Structure 1
């Protein structure tokens, strides 16, 4: 019983809560796609003054 107690304790110290991780993964993936789109939008800005000449 004491060994099972130490195993449950080590699991309480280290084990991750994966159900949080799935939601944070989905949010971070959507944020990555939005950041790539924002990078393209920022990249377009330089060409607007090409029409000036």
Structure 2
């Protein structure tokens, strides 16, 4: 009984909750795709100066 309790306790200490990581993972994949499109949008700055000359 004691060994079972100790194993359960250690798991209680250092186990994750995968349901939260799934949501966070989805949000982060969307956010990274968005940050890439945002960076690509920001990159094309200063490209308009050529038209001035």
Measured against the shorter chain, the TM-score band is over 0.9
- Structure 2: runs of 5 or more not aligned: none
TM-score if structure 2 supplies the norm length?
0.95
Point out 4+ residue stretches in structure 1 off by more than 6 angstroms.
Answer: none
Number of aligned residue pairs: give it.
53
- Structure 1: runs of 5 or more not aligned: none
Partner Cα distance (1:9, 1:46) in 2: 59
Q: Indicate the structure with greater helix content.
A: 1
TM-score if structure 1 supplies the norm length?
0.95
